[PDB]
Design a binder for this molecule. Structure first.
Ligand SMILES: NC(=O)c1ccc[n+]([C@@H]2O[C@H](COP(=O)([O-])OP(=O)(O)OC[C@H]3O[C@@H](n4cnc5c(N)ncnc54)[C@H](OP(=O)(O)O)[C@@H]3O)[C@@H](O)[C@H]2O)c1
Ligand SMILES: NC(=O)c1ccc[n+]([C@@H]2O[C@H](COP(=O)([O-])OP(=O)(O)OC[C@H]3O[C@@H](n4cnc5c(N)ncnc54)[C@H](OP(=O)(O)O)[C@@H]3O)[C@@H](O)[C@H]2O)c1
Ligand SMILES: NC(=O)c1ccc[n+]([C@@H]2O[C@H](COP(=O)([O-])OP(=O)(O)OC[C@H]3O[C@@H](n4cnc5c(N)ncnc54)[C@H](OP(=O)(O)O)[C@@H]3O)[C@@H](O)[C@H]2O)c1
Ligand SMILES: NC(=O)c1ccc[n+]([C@@H]2O[C@H](COP(=O)([O-])OP(=O)(O)OC[C@H]3O[C@@H](n4cnc5c(N)ncnc54)[C@H](OP(=O)(O)O)[C@@H]3O)[C@@H](O)[C@H]2O)c1
Ligand SMILES: CC1(C)c2[nH]c3ccccc3c2C[C@@]23CN4CCC[C@]4(C[C@@H]12)C(=O)N3
Ligand SMILES: CC1(C)c2[nH]c3ccccc3c2C[C@@]23CN4CCC[C@]4(C[C@@H]12)C(=O)N3
Ligand SMILES: CC1(C)c2[nH]c3ccccc3c2C[C@@]23CN4CCC[C@]4(C[C@@H]12)C(=O)N3
Ligand SMILES: CC1(C)c2[nH]c3ccccc3c2C[C@@]23CN4CCC[C@]4(C[C@@H]12)C(=O)N3
Lengths: 256, 257, 257, 257
């Protein structure tokens, strides 16, 4: 594997998809830097990651708490996470899955700041990553930055139009960063229905009616496993020719 | 013959360029047009020629309102005023939004948190505020339409205008979400290519002639797009009562070479 | 005032359904329409039904030609003749192709090499034969247009019409290739959704009523597409001299739910 | 550690180019590879190349069969032998199709009904014949995959390859239909960009060095695609048990410039 000695920055690797990416990354022996905002399960996630890979050097699994939902500190924090992840070396791949995980208000009660508050973590944080990565990454086709969107960008869930919009912005912005940061490669993974611990939290009591309706809306009779969706991120790290692309893993939900 | 005769159109951003050609086309079909802009004068100037290129129309079918949508205070109450004015005694039949800041972004080496967020109030919050308040001034019927604006830069972004390609990418995704939020009302996007509007003359300054010639060369047609040809996409989307959630791309085959 | 008045329109497949509505819309703008079909009876009925909806139109603006484009040994020759009389004295301005066999394919249990290959003559070979010979009969100029036909089934295919989803997917890609082969002439595609033409009731037989509800429900609008609304997409692509390499999708938001 | 270890992979078109790189990658994970080609020599030679780069693998994990899929008789029966072979006593886990004629089409001045039709036997009929017979040789299970092949030319067609761009458009649409026909089995497409296989040098001849220089410049990366990088997309779809109905594009950003 050519991801053995690799340094990968997983912005949002404390839970769900991003965590599965650090598990997959550690399976190939890479050095993984994790970024989250909750200090306690960031201890739990990183402690959880070296008992599933106990032969891996513990110093190759580093964590930092960063709050990227706040307009100050995010440039200072993104720059700090790139310093920690780069170390003496340069970072080889960056993965961003961080999202605010909050239900928007209905459209009749839409507020100006309601529209803008997601943009800080969906748009401003990656752009600050794109702002500062040349100093911490070599702009060569062997390095990658991968952003996150979803199938909801084409089949929006009801109530979620605004965040459904921002994922549309992530995909267009991804392509622009492939020109801004060329020949460095940047791409997007667009997952479908992944039953992460966060999703269980969002829908609460309406969860099981939603799981069965998600399973029914797939060519597979399934929702997506977190470690299978993680293969899309690993793919874009190993494919030194993929750039400006959208990797869609949705179980055929857009076909039914 | 024409079903846009008695129909009411609100063109948010119709004072120049593409939006103005949409108001000209709408009045060519006899529609009642309300125009929204920010420059106080040049808003009379386009209102002046449209009763002078078609004096046929009753002068009260061409009404105008000044709105500043670049500032987060003022945006909900300004669109609300323009919707009361376009609807009048009836309800609005079609809404067209072309309003955009049209100012050069910084390079991303000097990217600031404010550079990223300020385009969104006119590109994202203004249309969402339209979607918030249009039900009381439009009937939610498939004979009604709301059309947003995109570009080919959403798929082939201009160096480096990455941040605003994102917002146009957000416009397309948001369009689809609003097509289900406002069902059975129709929501769509127009994605123009290279149109030589009076703003583009201003933004390109001295690099204009080198850019016009490379735009004509990046086309299957050997030309740039007329504003009056692109306006047909907005007029088309008002007449097609089955088109919703779609992107009408008119770019001279630019994405093909 | 209208720029489709003197123009020559050839609708390959204008004897029924969507293509027929395109000739109705074209005649509303005063165009000279040549109709092409394979059924001598559906071709006399179509020209008769168009001289009772437009009695003021000159009878020479509605001429028809009989062509069987499902057969390989004469599809090139038939296309050639259709072109020559549609141009007449002058040149052809726009060509619209909707022709399709509209017969259910066999299930995958009985798929045959010929089942897969026969549709290609009318879906792929006839349009390519049109592009091969139109230069003597059209000005390859941006005010000229060639429009092919696709559907939403190319992205949401219907069971078991997988093979015809393939051919409609092939039409969209070649559309883009012919915009470069035929540049600066304009080539585009319309992708309709659910249009209840007379061919569609024939395929659905007794399951028709259950299928209409199914479609109606599965759309953002509460409707199927009118033939006269989908026809707006073809007329639009004739009026927008900048639209090229594009896909005009008319689906009632079916791809959103 | 590896879940492609006991896995049986059928690479239809693995004697050269991309499909060959897919068989190399599969054997790196310990998969059992069945290779299909039409050149007996290439096929033995290709199998010889693979057991000298992997001398430790059991030679029975590298089995080959000669198939001519260019002809209407024997193509269903050759697909059927190849399925028995790959399956053996177990069932097939993944199928990869890269087989293509790789010959320059004639110009449109000499376009014939047969030049158009003939590619469809290997572009469309062979995969459909694979989907027709694989259920007795594959589970219809989410852990098994069928991967077809398209390319970036389906969206930015190279001249004069319009007809072959069309067939690649059919493969992607057919992929989506086959993802529903064979559900819950997974069906997908890989859309490579510029890969300098020996077949591409054969087509480009003396214009090769000028063509690679213009291909490298038309990418965001300053390179063409490695066969070993593009093969990772096929391996990925074996690895992602949630990917279905998708297009994995690996083109070096050529569609951005
Ligand atoms: N799951 C799906 O079906 C689906 C579909 C489409 C798109 N997506 C996108 O996939 C990505 C991953 O989603 P997920 O299912 O894995 O949910 P998740 O487990 O909640 O992932 C969120 C990650 O981001 C962190 N985070 C939350 N707020 C943060 C903040 N202000 N600043 C920095 N980090 C923050 C979280 O750490 P903390 O513990 O500190 O909060 C966590 O590590 C998201 O972008 C999502 O929008 C998911
Ligand atoms: N022309 C092209 O080649 C091209 C290409 C791709 C995309 N587009 C997009 O198409 C749309 C039309 O562009 P255009 O070429 O026609 O330029 P334009 O003539 O300047 O159109 C701008 C319209 O919106 C108004 N406007 C600007 N800022 C406003 C603000 N804060 N509040 C309210 N109204 C405001 C303008 O009037 P004021 O004078 O009062 O500001 C004008 O009526 C834009 O969204 C553009 O991004 C254009
Ligand atoms: N209806 C829908 O909902 C829908 C949706 C998506 C896509 N489409 C596609 O749009 C196109 C039009 O479909 P439609 O609904 O209008 O069905 P249609 O009424 O049967 O249209 C078929 C047209 O093509 C002609 N035609 C058929 N075979 C011919 C042949 N060998 N030679 C010459 N002409 C031939 C027909 O005339 P003859 O009487 O001589 O056969 C007729 O004018 C089709 O390609 C269809 O697949 C339709
Ligand atoms: N390289 C690119 O730039 C590029 C770009 C887009 C798409 N693609 C697509 O990628 C696929 C792979 O191409 P490639 O470049 O790897 O070319 P390649 O090496 O020529 O691949 C051809 C493969 O197909 C087999 N094949 C050809 N004709 C056959 C027949 N009649 N029966 C059975 N097998 C047959 C060949 O075997 P024999 O020669 O043994 O018969 C060989 O295994 C092709 O579909 C190509 O169009 C390639
Ligand atoms: C819609 C959602 C509540 C949901 N409902 C499910 C049912 C079954 C399996 C997964 C889900 C999910 C995951 C989602 C996907 N959406 C993409 C942008 C906003 C949202 C909301 C959230 C998100 O971030 N996670
Ligand atoms: C890039 C731009 C300066 C430009 N350069 C040209 C050269 C030749 C012909 C047209 C143009 C245009 C029109 C554009 C298209 N872009 C889409 C989003 C931002 C921007 C900027 C502006 C816009 O709104 N109008
Ligand atoms: C599938 C079909 C029988 C169908 N079943 C419906 C139920 C409700 C409303 C509309 C339909 C339609 C319209 C379709 C769409 N398909 C696109 C290519 C082939 C086909 C077949 C036909 C076509 O041309 N018209
Ligand atoms: C067009 C082609 C001759 C070509 N010309 C190049 C110049 C520089 C770098 C790469 C190429 C290629 C690779 C291509 C891509 N096309 C996709 C379908 C048919 C074809 C033909 C062939 C293919 O399979 N490989």
């Amino acid at each position: 594997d050519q991801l053995h000695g690799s340094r990968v920055l997983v912005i949002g690797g404390t839970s769900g998809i991003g965590f599965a990416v650090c598990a997959a990354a550690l399976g190939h022996g890479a050095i993984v830097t994790i970024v989250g905002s909750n200090a306690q399960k960031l201890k739990d996630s990183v402690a959880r990651l070296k008992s599933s890979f106990p032969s891996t050097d513990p110093d190759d699994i580093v964590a930092v708490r960063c709050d990227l939902s706040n307009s100050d500190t995010v440039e200072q924090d993104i720059e700090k996470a790139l310093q920690l992840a780069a170390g003496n070396s340069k970072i080889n791949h960056i993965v961003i899955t961080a999202a605010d995980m909050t239900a928007p208000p209905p459209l009749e009660d839409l507020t100006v700041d309601s529209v803008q508050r997601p943009g800080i973590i969906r748009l401003v944080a990656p752009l600050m990553v794109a702002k500062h990565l040349p100093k911490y990454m070599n702009k060569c086709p062997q390095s990658s930055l991968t952003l996150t969107s979803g199938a909801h960008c084409l089949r929006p869930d009801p109530g979620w139009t605004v965040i459904s919009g921002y994922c549309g912005a992530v995909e267009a912005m991804s392509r622009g960063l492939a020109i801004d940061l060329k020949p460095l490669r940047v791409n997007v993974v667009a997952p479908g229905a992944v039953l992460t611990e966060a999703v269980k939290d969002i829908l609460g009591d309406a969860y099981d009616a939603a799981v069965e309706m998600a399973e029914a809306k797939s060519t597979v009779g399934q929702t997506g496993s977190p470690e299978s969706v993680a293969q899309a991120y690993i793919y874009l790290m190993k494919d030194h020719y993929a750039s400006g692309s959208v990797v869609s893993t949705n179980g055929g939900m857009l076909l039914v």
